[PDB]
Each structure stands twice: as C-alpha cells, then as structure tokens.
Amino acid sequence: PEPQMVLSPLTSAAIFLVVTIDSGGEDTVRDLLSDVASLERAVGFRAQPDGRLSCVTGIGSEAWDRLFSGARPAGLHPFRELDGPVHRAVATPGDLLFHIRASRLDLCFALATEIMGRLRGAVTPQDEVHGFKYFDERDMLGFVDGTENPTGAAARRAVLVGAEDPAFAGGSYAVVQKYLHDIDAWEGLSVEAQERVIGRRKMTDVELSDDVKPADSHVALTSVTGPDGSDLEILRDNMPFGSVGREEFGTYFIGYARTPEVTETMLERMFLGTASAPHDRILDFSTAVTGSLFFTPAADFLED
Amino acid sequence: PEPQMVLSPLTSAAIFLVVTIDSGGEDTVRDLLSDVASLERAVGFRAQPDGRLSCVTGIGSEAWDRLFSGARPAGLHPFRELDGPVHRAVATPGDLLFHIRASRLDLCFALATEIMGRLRGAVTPQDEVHGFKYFDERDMLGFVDGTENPTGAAARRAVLVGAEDPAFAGGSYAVVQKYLHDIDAWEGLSVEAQERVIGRRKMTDVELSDDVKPADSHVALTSVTGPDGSDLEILRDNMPFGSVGREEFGTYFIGYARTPEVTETMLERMFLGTASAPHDRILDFSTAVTGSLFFTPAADFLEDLS
Amino acid sequence: EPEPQMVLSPLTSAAIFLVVTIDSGGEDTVRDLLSDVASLERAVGFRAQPDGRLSCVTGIGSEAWDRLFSGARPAGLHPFRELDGPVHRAVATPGDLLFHIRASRLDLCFALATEIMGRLRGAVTPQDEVHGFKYFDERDMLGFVDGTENPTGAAARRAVLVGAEDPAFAGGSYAVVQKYLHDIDAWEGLSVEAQERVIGRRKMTDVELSDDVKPADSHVALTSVTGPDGSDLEILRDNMPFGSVGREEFGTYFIGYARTPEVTETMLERMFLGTASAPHDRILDFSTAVTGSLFFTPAADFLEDL
Amino acid sequence: PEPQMVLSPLTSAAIFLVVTIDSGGEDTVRDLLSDVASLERAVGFRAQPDGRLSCVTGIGSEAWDRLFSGARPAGLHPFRELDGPVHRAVATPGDLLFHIRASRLDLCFALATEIMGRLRGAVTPQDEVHGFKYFDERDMLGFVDGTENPTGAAARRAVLVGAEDPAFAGGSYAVVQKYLHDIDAWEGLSVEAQERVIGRRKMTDVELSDDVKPADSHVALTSVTGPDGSDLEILRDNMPFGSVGREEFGTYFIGYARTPEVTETMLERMFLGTASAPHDRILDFSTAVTGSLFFTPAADFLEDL
Amino acid sequence: EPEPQMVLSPLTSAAIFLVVTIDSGGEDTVRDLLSDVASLERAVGFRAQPDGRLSCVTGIGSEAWDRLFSGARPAGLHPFRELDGPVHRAVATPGDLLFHIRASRLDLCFALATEIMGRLRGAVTPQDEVHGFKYFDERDMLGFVDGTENPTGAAARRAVLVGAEDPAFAGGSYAVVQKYLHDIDAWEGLSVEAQERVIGRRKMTDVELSDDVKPADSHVALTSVTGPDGSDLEILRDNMPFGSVGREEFGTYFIGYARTPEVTETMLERMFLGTASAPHDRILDFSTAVTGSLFFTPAADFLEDL
Amino acid sequence: EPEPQMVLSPLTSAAIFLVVTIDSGGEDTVRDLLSDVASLERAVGFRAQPDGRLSCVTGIGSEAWDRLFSGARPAGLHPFRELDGPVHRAVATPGDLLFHIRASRLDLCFALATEIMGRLRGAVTPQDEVHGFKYFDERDMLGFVDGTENPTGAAARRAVLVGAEDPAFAGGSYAVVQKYLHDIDAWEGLSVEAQERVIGRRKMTDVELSDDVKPADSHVALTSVTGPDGSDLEILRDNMPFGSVGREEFGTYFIGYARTPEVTETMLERMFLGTASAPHDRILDFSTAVTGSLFFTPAADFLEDL
C-alpha cells in the first residue's frame, strides 16, 4: 500500500482546513476524494523541486459511516473530551481534515482554493489556520519544536497502520488541537522557570537531566513506554499561527500515530495528571479551543 | 537624507498594520517612532542575509497634527473619497501604517509583535493583512503584478521627495486600499476577455498592441503623461491575501509617489473615468473596502524624535 | 540485484540528445566506449556535485545489438515501426546508439558529450544532435506544463524497469524517441480554451479537464491506456524544448521509457491511427515527427562487464 | 541618461543574434526598437530574481543612416578588416545585434522568439549563437575567462560614452567576432606551453610574472597603456559555443568600450603584431569567421523612437 | 532491522575529527555519553535542518572495546598494524574513541564537539583534533579531484556495512584514519604531466589515464584491487583538507570505511610495501603519515541500548 | 577619487586573520607583495563569483610604516596603547602587517592566504593566525548576537574612512585587533538574566535593555559614546568566533575599524579603566585579551602605485 504523505520533508508553511459535510453533500465529497491526489500534482508540479507541496486528507468517525459501507478502521472513534480538575480538552465538530504543507504559503493557498472550489455547497468550514514556522524551528513559546520526532524506520513503525488491521494498512490517525497561549504570563517567567515547564534548555535544546527534570514538565508527561520497555512515539508537526491586533498567539498541534491509543494516553497524562504530577505545566500557559480525531487512509483507498 | 526602505528588493511576504491613536496615547507613539529602526535591526540582523526584513512607517494627516508641532509636508491631506456613477473609493480611518516585508512571514510577525507590544493601550487596530506573493509574481486574478514598476534612478526620481519640499526630502507618500475580488464573475470570462480588462496578455505578460488595447483597460487608464509628455510613475507592491473558508480573495494595493497628486490622478481616472472610458473595468470585479494616505518620513526624521 | 542506469533522474533543465549509427568495422571501438561510459559520467560530473546532476543513459538499437553482442536478445527489442495513418505518419529513421544526457547546466552536458564523441571518432556517423532546455515553470514549446502525470517512486520502478519477465535483462528499459517540429503560428492562433481542448488540461493551472468535457481526441484522453486487468499502463517522459529562432524551428524532443515497448506503441497507435471515437490526436494537427527510433537501455552492470 | 544593461552581473547563458535589414524593413525595425525594453521586462519580470535576463541592442554604421536622421555617433564606422602576414580578421554583414544574457538559456530563447517574431519579413539572419559558460568560469580552451575585466566605476569609465560625444552619452561600442578552435592542436601542448600562450596559470589563474610572460602571450598583447601611462580597458563577456557532431568548438568574443579605438588597437596588436611579437599566439589555435562593429545607444534613445 | 550510523552521509563541506584516549576510571562516564550521543546530535542539528546535514559517527578502538564491554567482540577488530616499508612507514598512534562530525557548516560541527567533550571532561585525554574544509570543486591539497571513484547506492552499502557474516554486529563498519602532511614545495616542482603519472588521472578534467599509459606505481593502480572471484574490492573515503599557512602545514585527513579492515589493509600493504612491479605508491614521496588508528563504528541501536 | 580597500564588505561567514612581523631586510619583498595583493584577490576569487565574496584588507603598523616608507605619515598612526587597569589589562603585542581575509567559505580565504605567504616566505615571521567561523545566527561564543548596532550605508562610510582631516591619506582607515579568550565555565554559571545585565541586551531576541534597567557597567553602556556636538561616535566591527575543543579554548577575535583611533581608544579606556559610574566593563570578567595591535589600512590606489 502507498501511504499519503504523512512522512513529509520539513515545511515552513501550512494550511489546516477542518470542515463538516452538509446533508446531501456525500457524493460531491466522494468525487473530490478520488481526485485529491491529482489536484496535488496539478498545483505542485510546476513549482518543484523547491515547493514541497503535499496534502494529507482525514475522515472523522461519524463522517465515515455516512460515506462508506463495509469495514471500519479498528481505532476510529470521535475525539474523547477530557475534563480534568483544572484544565479541559474540548471536543469540537469536524468531518474532514486537509493538512496542506509546502515551503511557501501561496502553494498551500492555491491547493486549498481548488479543493474548497470543488466542495462549495457540500460542506461548512469549521476551522481555517495558516501556519508559519519561525526560521529556527521555534514555536510561539520560543522553544525548538519537533526535535524528538522519530525518523526513517522508527517513523514508519510509529505512524503507519500494518498487519494488525490489514484492510487499512498504510493509513494513520491524526489528532488536532488548536491552542492559544498566554504570552504575557509566560514572558514573566525566568528562562530557567520556562525550562522547568518544557523539560529542555531554551537556547541549546538539550534535554534536562533526569535528576533535575520535573515530574510535571511537558517532556516528562509525554514520555510513555510500552510493555516491552520500548518508547511509544508519535509524529508531530506543530505550527505557530496568530494575529497581532487581536492578541492571538497560538500553536496548532497535530499528532500522527498508528493507533489513537498512544496519543490518547499522552493527553490523559497532560490533562488529568498522574500520582506524581497534577497536570502538564504547559497547560498553565496554553488553552485548547478545538479537538478532533481523523483517519488518514492509504492513497490507494482514496483512488478507488 | 537617508530614506526608509521604500525601494526594497523583491519580497514574498508582508504584514500591513493600520492603527488609530487613542486619546492620550501620543507620547507613547513618539517614543515608539524613535525606536522603530532599532527594533527592525534587532529582529532582522540575526536572520541576514536571506531574511530581507524591512519596516516602512507612515503617518496620516490628522495624526501628524497631534504628534508634531511645526511644519507639515506640503502634500499631506486626508484620503479623498471618490464617488463615481458606478464605483466608489472609500476613506477609512488610519493614523499609523506599518508596512512590514521580508522573505518569510514569521520575520514580519516577530517585528509586528514587538511594535504592537510597545503600543498596547495607546492605539486601536483598524486593519491587519497577512500577504503572500505567488511564485511567478502573479496576483489573485492570474496576471503578473509589478512588471512596469520603475527601477534604479527612475524609481528614486518617482518616489522620493526632493527640492520641492526640502525639510521633508527623503520622504514619500503611500496610498493603501484593500480590494476584494469577485472571483466567480472573473473566471466566467474567457482568457481573451480578461486580457481586454487588464491590457496585457495573461500567460506571457506582453502588452497588447495599441491597435487592440481598449481605452477602459487597466493599463490604459493608469498610464498618464505630464505636461512635457514624460510618463508619470508610481511604485507599487501589491500583495494577495485571503481566506478560503469565507471566500475572501483580495489584493492589498500600496502605491508610493513623490507627491500624492500622481496617485490621486490615476484613482480619478479609474473611478470617475475619461472622455472615452466610463471607468476602469478592473473595478467591475474589484471592490475597495479601505482607503488611506500616509506620509513616510526620512529615517533620520524618526530617529531625531521624542 | 542489477543496477539500472539513471533512467529515473531528478528534474533537469538541460539535456543533450545524441543519436549515431555505427560505421562498418567500428564494432570494437564502440564496445570499449560502452565499458567506460559510466566512468566518464563520474569524471565529468563528480566535481560539479551536488548541483550539477549530470547523468547519461545509453541505448542500443535492434540491428546494432546483433552486430555487437552474441547470445541472448532483449525480448521487446525490434526496429521502430512506421505508422502510416490516413492523415499523420510516424516515420522510422536510422539510429544504432542513443546518449541521453541530462544536467542542471548545458555546459556539463556538452563536456560529457565531447568526451564520448572523442572516443568514437571515425567509428560512428552522427544522425541527430539536439540541445534541449526546459522553461522555468516546467512548460514546453506549446506553453503547457509538461511532465505532471509521470509516475514517481515505486510505480515509476514497476512501469519502467524490466524484471522477471526477461531475467537476463532485468534492470533495463526501452526508450522511444521522436523529434517533433511545431507550427507555432497555427498554435498561437487558437484561443486558450481551444488549446485546453487539444491537450486535455487547463493551461494556467494545469488541472485536468473533467471527464464530461474532455474531448475524445485530446492528447491526454488518447494516451490514457488501461490493460487487460484494468491497470493504467504508464510511461516515464522527459520531453525537452529545442529550436533556432533564425530558421523558425520550434520543437519538442519526445523521449519515453517503458518496461516493454508495447505500452508506448499502443499510445502511438492511438495517436496516429485513431480509435472508434477519435480520428487522431489533435496535438498532431500542430506537430510533425521528423525522426523516430527504438532503443534498449541495458542495466549499468551489463555495460561494465563488457 | 540611462544606459542599457551593458554592465551586467555574471550570466551563464547567452544568445547572440545578428541580422541585416531587408529593403523596406526600416519602419518595422524602428517600431521594434521602441519596444525592446518593454519586451525584456515582459519575459523577465516573472522569473526574477534568479533569471537575470537582459538584452543589449546594437546598430551598425550603414543601418544608422537608413534608420535615423541627424547626428551620428562620432566613433561609428564599419568593422575594419586586418589582413596580417599569417592571420586575418574578417569583416562580415550585420545591421543589428541582439546580445541576450540570462541564468538559463530558455529565458534567452523566449526573448529572442518575441524579438524575431516582430521582425519577421523585415530582416535576414546572419548569425545565431547559443552560448554556455562552464561552471567554473572557464572558456573552451580550459582557462578562467573574465578575471581582469574592470568593475564598478572603473568599468563605467571604460565602457560608457560621456562628455566627448554628449548627444550620445550613456551608450557604448561593441565589437563581435566568432572564433573556431582547433582543439586537437591545443590539447597537444602541455599545460606549461598553454600557460605561455595565455599569460596566466591554468589551474590557479595567477598572472605569470613580467620576466616570464612571453611577449607574444595573449595577456601581453592585449595589455595597452594610454599616452599618460594609464591602462586602456575593455569589458568582455566571451562565451563558449559548439556542436559535437560537426566538431565545432567556439569562442564568441564580444567587447564593449567607450570608443572603438581601444578595441581596434588591441586587435591590431593581435593580428599584425609589434616589434617583439609576430602575432598573438592564441590565433595559432583560433580562427575568426565573423567580425562586426555596433553602437549600443542609451536606453532612453530607443524608448523615444 | 539494525539501523546503521550515518556512515553513508550526503556530501558535506565541513568536518571535525576528534580522537581521544580514555583515562583510568573514565569507563562509566564514556558509556553514559555513548548512550546519549544520538540525542545530542538531534539537539544541536534539528533546528538547522534541512540544510545543516549534521551527523556524528562514533568509533571504538580494539583495546578500548574490552575495557568498555563484556561479551563478544566484532570479528575484525584489532589495533592498527604498523607497516615498516623500505622507504615509507605507516605509523600506529593511540586512539580509543573517534568522533567523525560532518555538516554543511563548521559551526554545527563545533557546537556538537563542544557538547560531547563537555560531558567527557575528566574521563578522556585528546590525542588529535582536525578541522576539515572542502575546496569548492572537491579538490585536495594536491589539486586533484578527491572522491570520484567512491561507490554509491547499493554498491556502497555492500562495500561498507557488516552483514550476515558477523550477525551480532550487523549494521557496523570499520574505519581507518591517517593524518597526512604534504611536501607542497616538492609537488609544485613537478610538471602537471608528472603529477598525473603519480595519481593516474588527468588533473584538470579528472579523466582516468588509459591502462597502457597509467604507471604501475600510480596511486590509482595500487589502490585498485580485485578479489579471488575477480570482482573489485571497494572502500568509501571522505578525505578532508586541513592546514595552517603560518606553520606551512598542508594536509589530507584520510578516512576510509569498509565492511572488513582486510580490504583497507590490503590497499595499505600495496601502497607502503609495494608489489613485484611497483616499489611503493608514488603519492607517498610527497605525503607523510603522522597518525594511524583503526576503529569499529557500531550500529546506532547498539549505542542507544547501552 | 581614492578607492578604499574593502573595509565595508558584505556579510561573510568565514575569515582568516594573519598577523606577521617583517624580518630585518624583508622590506623590499614586502613592498612588491603589497603592490600585487589586489591582483591576487582577483585571481583567487574570480572563478568563485558571485557567491564567494572574497576580499583582503591589508594593514600596516606604525613601526613598519617608518621602515617601508619615507615622507608624511597618517596623523593617527602610533603603536597600540597598553592599558593598565586596577583589575584588567589590555596588552600590546608585536605586529607589522595585518591581512584580514573574508569570504563565504574558508577555502577561498585559505587559498588567498597561501598565495600571500608564499610570496613573503623568508621576509616575515608569523605572530598570529586565526581561522574564524560565524554561527548560523550571527552569535558569538557567549551566546549573544554580535554586530547588530554596526553602522550601515552612508553612516558607515562617514565613521570608518579618513577624509579632509588628513587629506594625503583619504580613503584609509585604522584597524584595532585584539584576540580574546573566554572563561566559559564561569559565564555558564550565570543565569540568562544575569548574562543580559553584563551585555546590555536580551539574549534570545537581541532587543536593547530599557534605559531604566540597563546597568552602568554593561557592555553596551560603556561602548556607547557621544561627541561634544551630541553626535554618536561609531566604529565598524566584524568580530569572529574561533576555538579548539580539545584545548578548551573558546574565543572572540575582535576587529574594529574607524576613521581615527581616538574613537576606538575612548571605548577601550571606558572598558578597561572605567568611568565615574562603572569600575570596568563586566564583559572583561569573562574575557581576557591576549593580543593587541593597531594598523593603518591605506586606500587601494596607495598600494597599487608602489
């Protein structure tokens, strides 16, 4: 099976598009699905090799049942709301996801325009986010973001559905959350206090040693080990976004995994806490305003 | 006089911020204006040479009177509304303009944050546009945008105030209009009909012959000669922007000129028309939703403030 | 496993195409050259890496094969077959060797060409030399993006490289070449929308026409072939513009690689002889083939152990 | 006044077009001259900043009188043939020169196509050369080519007409010659011998010292000093060209100068020699097959036609 | 199933070679650093991707291996063997750990070397530190192109990575380093033609000399070796220039990877001790070895699992 | 109009600083080299244009000048003035010629340095050789951005080039060099906020500390100087990192250019001796000067005319 481009080269721009399907809009949706790879080539080819344009297309749980009969991927369910003692992970509507990435925003915008043009009258936009990475891979909190992502074989093992669900091999599961930051509060901390919240040094990006790293630091709470003592990993491509005039400074989280159970265990640790950690300290400066879960099929599924 | 970076090398991203100055906010703005060049260096230096970050700061006519006590640039006035039979050019509020450009959008955003941090509580935002150039210099209508801009000595002569206003030599005047387009109407026309709207061929950007170029084309109406028969010129750096979800597809227009009279004359011809042309046909697919005029002083003028 | 030649190459903006016949008694000099071509490619290109992106793919003709080697023949190796259609004809012309040379810069291509021809002087006669350049936005001489639908990755490998079906020649491929001359005057007299109907795609945006409007005699519809099982039969193209302004020669050099010549020959038959629903490919109304040959490009290790 | 792009940044591709004007062709040519700066911006603007497309247009002595009335540039005359004891600098026909330069040949070709599309039926082609520099600024003989070109204000002084001819300030004079090389004879020398021909080291491009540099080396003959002992300089943008099947290996010479007499003095020294040199030894491996002289007017001159 | 280290790196223009010995009692501090070195690679390099191309290959010497680890040793690991030739000698010099650090820029190499050596203060003693730089056209200090005949792709894998023959260390390699200093005065006293006869390729164009003119004592003749079956034996080199103008030190840092040190050893034996037809490699009359050490570079999983 | 040397260079990522003394009887050989160095720059640089940006600025010391030249001398040319503070000391060390060689890559620098030294062998003795490298974000070894408030354009020319105040030497400049080593262990035990109070700017964002919080003994405070007429007295710096990881040597090579050494001297006096409000520059609590030399860099034509 040929996968969609979940395993993309690094990109500096992105458009995230989340829509719901209107009643009656199912067949227009299906026709787009069968053409989305053709559109990707059409927009991207003339801008190569620097463009790096790709599109990953996801389908939510409730949408799947409307669109397709027969077998359902084994881990597809709606996003699970988490109501912690202090912080909460909200669940918000979404039926399709377009994750569009490139080296420049104009290529993302071009592709989005063609997709949205084909769907007009068949869907309702829920969220549109134009992301940009800082030139040194830093996020809105000023920390490098992406450093521990798996690469090569480890990435394929972590991200791609295999023989555990054969009919859907080559697919993946995407979780999105739009965060908005309290920048005023964050900038009132010392750099050393920010370090203790994330778990790594700010300027040099070196992990804090195990003797100094807090139990409630981000890196601590999202480090998860499986039965066999192996690291359970996800692949993230978080993107900064914002608006200077409305004081909107955000991180657009997106995490890919082979099963949602990994990502969901991480979110439970962050929002609900553990015996040794009340919650992820990053959430004292970060509020989630969306939350959705999708299955991103194999490319050959969409073609048929 | 050292100008601000009006004559920038080509850039693929911009932010345009327009703000009004609240009652009492004047001292806070003066302090910021004296620091703006220092912030552009702080944000941009460590990204050289590929970052190409620059900020041009512009001040409106009403703001000028509140901020500065002495002489006024000769050409500085409120943007003049134009009510034609069909199309209107609106005047909207704007005291200060920050026109931020770079090779990437994050550098523009960093500078925009530092500026707005210094101005919080003293200004109200009126407009914020994130722009992005297409990879072949095309605008939202599919046409190459910028080809006939002046270059080198010719552009310096068209854009920068000189002897005519010598206390303000080294400044320029900028006109800003945000235009939204009707893209479904546009794409219903045949390529050849689009070529009659603009005045140039779509794929190869070659100007149409004088034998075929309609009088109400955009290229006809915006070409002006002076008394002596020499061409009057402006420098533009129009930027696409928009939102696919809301079907907003736009051009942010910005023109710089040594005097407003040249840009005003062009606007007059587009909206009000001529003996042979009712109006610029590009306006049958473009609506103006903002309209403001700004003087962009010499860089030393800003440094020497309090 | 056999090592292919660089049939599957990264994009290149320049090429040279060299087609020669082997003179009587020149067999031995050609064999020696074959054994060193890969070493010449390295010697010219290695110091210009990684931006140079120099490669050469060598092919051999049906009659030449039997002159050079003894033992087995590749299964699909045969002379280019002439196509005499009611209107358009595909000519067969002589050619014993093909050098298909690619790089980011024409001077690298010329340097390698110089070395190869240096070694073959007096043993071969030139038939065709074309120096190709692609336009900055992947357009061809007709002003359409060209190469959009080529296969990539693993599908490219399955479509082009010989496998188990002919195990002695696994890792090889078949090249068909055709030099075409365009009537650019006729072409440039069509509207864009009518050009879109000849090719089967949008010109500016390169989006394929939908199935309810795509003509049966467009290029894309005729070169779209399904097999027995209903698999799309695919080829890999690297078409290159060429020409001379002074002699009015505006051309497309066609080259297509395929695991078996049958696929390329079925497309040619549909172009030239037509189907029940299409008399011929409308592209031929603006395009005339002046050369035509068929070559086998063996695995690189076959040429080495020569 | 605004000069044409004579002073170009380095480009790796070029197209040289030389044509003659047919009977009744003048009107069509004048209309194109008025348009060629607009055409350059039309082809080039959308491929900026990497494209570096420029067109310099040149007019020959005979053509000037057919196209324009009134003043002539003071230095404009037909190319002067030089019949040396061994080597000959030939004169051939040309009314108009288009010198087209870019980072890639497709851009050069697109411009050329539009210019010639406008001139079709008015003009006859004399020469068309597509040129390519090697990736390390080397020419067909294997040497670095362009090292001692002047730069900056020194180039401007050497190349652009000024006060001496104020009606034509901002323009320049271009001499073109196409050279074919005998590569097999060149590759027969050792490197040391080739260095003696040129006047510089082959790999490092360091000039041979005055005591070792032969009097008949290329660098020695083309190094001229004025009355006051100042150096007379030209700007060159030589380009390799060829065809492997016909065994054609070429340099296209093009030199610009504020007066033709500098370039002509250098040609004299090369083909006729001096007291201590019979001729330029580069000529023992290089044969001139065209020669023409052109004036390249200020760009405003053409725009105003 | 094993993941190798980055032995097969893309081309890099900067390097740092660090060789250290492990002090008495430093074993535990070393093992902890070995388990983190891949993490430190990401820490330094991630934020400069994708153009940074930062990597670190870590190797371990024979004596060191027994001090650090209990259980099996890699089959070919032993100390560098000194070669005492009639004229030329290849010395063995102490070395327990190699860090071969490559990137597109020297700052990334230096930052990573800083972090590694910071963790190892107190536990190791430096023996050598070289800062390598590319000449821009892949030349070495002798002015010849250096790298041309290196294997690529599949051939490279097979030549470099330990396989089924030593399954516990699959994904490993063996590295041989020698720092050479050149007599540049002597070399530049040669004609280019004489320099060509030393190396066995043309200087300017890098084309290999024909088999009937290439001397038997030429560098290329003596490092060309065939196996029992007749097949070539290959190694992967990434030789780097280094130097100090004031002290007249002009050098080549030789580094050569192979799946077994027998291949590299056979090349060295042929260079230093000669054959029946060649006394020694002529390159050594202008090149003196001042270090020599052998290391095993384990699979990446081996280190992390520590 | 006298042509300056390339004091005002574009940004470069690599440098070699070469400081020599002239041996007894070497004057003639140095005079000949000085007259050819601009030719050597062209020869080495040209074939790497346009990315190479290779330049060499040649400096002559006070004692050397008197040895090489007769007649008038630059008005400001003296040996470096040793500074003996209560705590910290600026040393003076020998140096007759400075070569400041810059480029986008180290190989160009090294090849030019090799041509220069080759011509001078026998005539001069080396005193210092430093190979610098920039960090990808313009940072120094203390972790701060380094060069931000350097003058640019017309301001830079006015600051660095000699003019009508010494017209026989118009187009020259003065260069002061000091090699600094940093105690990084001591620096790294400060908090980020504490490091920011030493320098005078924020570490991550490079924004100037406000006038209400900037310490009197911070770097930026002490090196900000105003003239009688209220004008800012500016120098042009191109400080470069260097080091050796094995030796734990981590350095900044300081070089500053100005039209009179009185400007550079005033800033050194404030650092090492202090003011009324500050004992010394706190940056010297982590930085030790180990060289100190002053040179005059004549106009280009001065050097050619020899």
Ligand code: HEM
């Ligand atoms: C709320 C906004 C978020 C921000 C700004 C943020 C930023 C960071 C940064 C700076 C790191 C360390 C560098 C790196 O390895 O990338 C990190 C690590 C990580 N975060 Fe986040 N992150 C956010 C949310 C999330 C969420 C919601 C999840 C998971 C569901 C997640 C999972 C991870 C994981 C697994 C790692 C790597 C831990 C390791 O070293 O193994 N993060 N993130």
Ligand code: HEM
């Ligand atoms: C409404 C959105 C606008 C769009 C999409 C737009 C687009 C264009 C395009 C495509 C061209 C041709 C290529 C070139 O740039 O030279 C152009 C030319 C021009 N436009 Fe606009 N334009 C707009 C508004 C205006 C306005 C409001 C003015 C003046 C106030 C203006 C002044 C000009 C000028 C002066 C020219 C060059 C004409 C020439 O001298 O050949 N534009 N415009």
Ligand code: HEM
């Ligand atoms: C006059 C010569 C030619 C020109 C200028 C030309 C141009 C084009 C263009 C513009 C496309 C559409 C974009 C693309 O997918 O690359 C196309 C597609 C194609 N052409 Fe041609 N072509 C020519 C000759 C040939 C010939 C001789 C063949 C085959 C024997 C060929 C086979 C194809 C195929 C198979 C495709 C892809 C169809 C699809 O699956 O979408 N073409 N070519």
Ligand code: HEM
């Ligand atoms: C015949 C084909 C020609 C070739 C292959 C050629 C090649 C070269 C080369 C390699 C150099 C040395 C590097 C440099 O550019 O500075 C050079 C220098 C020069 N060439 Fe040519 N040249 C040719 C014809 C001519 C002609 C016809 C002229 C003038 C009429 C000329 C004038 C010069 C000048 C003035 C220099 C610079 C000398 C100096 O001041 O050092 N060349 N040529």
Ligand code: HEM
């Ligand atoms: C003084 C140190 C060295 C210098 C400057 C040097 C330089 C060269 C050069 C210029 C080439 C020809 C182009 C190419 O890389 O293929 C060459 C080839 C080669 N060198 Fe070295 N080398 C050195 C040491 C070594 C040593 C110590 C060995 C082996 C232990 C070695 C093995 C090779 C091999 C195998 C080739 C490939 C030959 C072939 O198959 O064509 N070299 N080297």
